Amino acid sequence: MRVRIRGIYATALTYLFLKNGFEIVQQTPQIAERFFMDIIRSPADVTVKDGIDKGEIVSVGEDIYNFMRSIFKYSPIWRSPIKLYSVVSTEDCKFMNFIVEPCLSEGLVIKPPVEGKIILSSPRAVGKFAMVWKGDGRTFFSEHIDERDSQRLLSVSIPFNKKGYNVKWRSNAAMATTAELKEELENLTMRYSYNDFREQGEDFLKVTLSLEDKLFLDDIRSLVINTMKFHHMLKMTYSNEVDIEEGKVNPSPEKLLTSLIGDNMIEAIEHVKPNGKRVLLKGGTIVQKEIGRDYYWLKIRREFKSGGIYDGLNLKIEDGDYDLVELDSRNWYQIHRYHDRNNNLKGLYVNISTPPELLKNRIRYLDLEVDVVKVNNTVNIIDLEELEANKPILGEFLYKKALEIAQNIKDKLNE
Ligand SMILES: [Mg+2]
Ligand SMILES: [Mg+2]
């Protein structure tokens, strides 16, 4: 299969796709040079790029799920049951088990249901190179079409604009022969006029990368060009700063890591659920930290006001209650020590997760559902059934690893 790759993971991903037999196409000149390969100006069967959040990789086109699940063992992967750019029929503003927006009775899926919500637009006939529908008769271009390639495309779609068809050129169109393009618009306009959208959808998946797989990608990228530890994690906040440091004699991520939690304050903990939803949890003051060449550790103090129950502990939250949270880049867990205003220990909550990432004034981790709670000398592994519910997207390796950690923590808490 021919694959097109963009975004902060592109070098590491290019290595791994090559290593697994894919044809790389539409390389940038800088990718071509790094892999000593020719730029192939051919359409891609599948496109891999950053998600809306740079901590995600998305894939659109042919299904590569089984391949992605074997590269990324320690990351949730969601395969869309709904093909992107399919056309669906709606009732009561629902399609199957999903909400749609807007509430079109017939609509083109333009965003998959990552969290149970499908984004629609008015139907269009979609091929690999173009989308067509009825309108004024205008030609639109993907952002990723160079100007040198636009005029050829316009010459093809102008006739169809005259007929009242809007034409959206997709970036793959720039690599297609002119005869392919003409055939494409002939077929698309004909299918549109018959209201025929069968089999037009494209497969979609999203990898929510853990720090474990980001470090694996740092290692892979290291085989091609100079790469610091935490390179990809830092590329969520920094751009050229990371490359500058990687040109130095012994590159270290220490200063850029320190800058993220510069002022010893965490405004929020991003608790990422298996499905990708980022849940903001209360932050606090960094009372102690250690940032080295290849790891970081922090102790955060979180202040609580009256209100509610502490999850797992089943204890009421009182004014002046505080949490001492220990987290470490090498650890798949955070130890929360819950105290009252007079420093009395209320309980211990061990949050199980993928290794914590650093963002500007924020911590991020992929929560693994199972937790371990200790109150007095009661030590309980909780929410095993919620880890089970999330096994299809977590995959078996994260699932097994969260069971090992849980057992380990219980044994330690019981000593
Ligand atoms: Mg948890
Ligand atoms: Mg829970």
Residue numbers in the entry: 1 to 415
How is this structure described in the published paper?
Here, we report two X-ray crystallographic structures of RNase G/E-like–DUF402 hybrid proteins from Pyrococcus furiosus and Sulfolobus acidocaldarius, at 2.1 and 2.0 Å, respectively.
The structure of the SaRNase W protein was solved to 2.0 Å by molecular replacement using the PfRNase W protein as a model. Two magnesium ions, two phosphate ions and two bound dinucleotides from the co-purified RNA are visible in the PfRNase W structure and only two magnesium ions in the SaRNase W structure. The domain orientations only vary slightly between both proteins; each domain can be superposed individually with an ∼1 Å rmsd on equivalent residues (across 58 atom pairs for N-terminal domain, across 6 atom pairs for S1 domain, across 53 atom pairs for 5′-sensor domain, across 33 atom pairs for α helical bundle domain and across 110 atom pairs for DUF402 domain). In the PfRNase W structure with a 5′-phosphate dinucleotide bound in the 5′-sensor domain, the central domain with R10 completes the recognition of the 5′-phosphate through a double hydrogen bond interaction. In the SaRNase W structure, the position of a bound 5′-phosphate (modeled in Figure 6B) would be 4.5 Å away from R10 (R4 in SaRNase W). We hypothesize that the difference in conformation arises from binding and recognition of a 5′-phosphate RNA, which locks the 5′-sensor and S1 domains in a productive conformation through the specific recognition of the 5′-phosphate by R10.
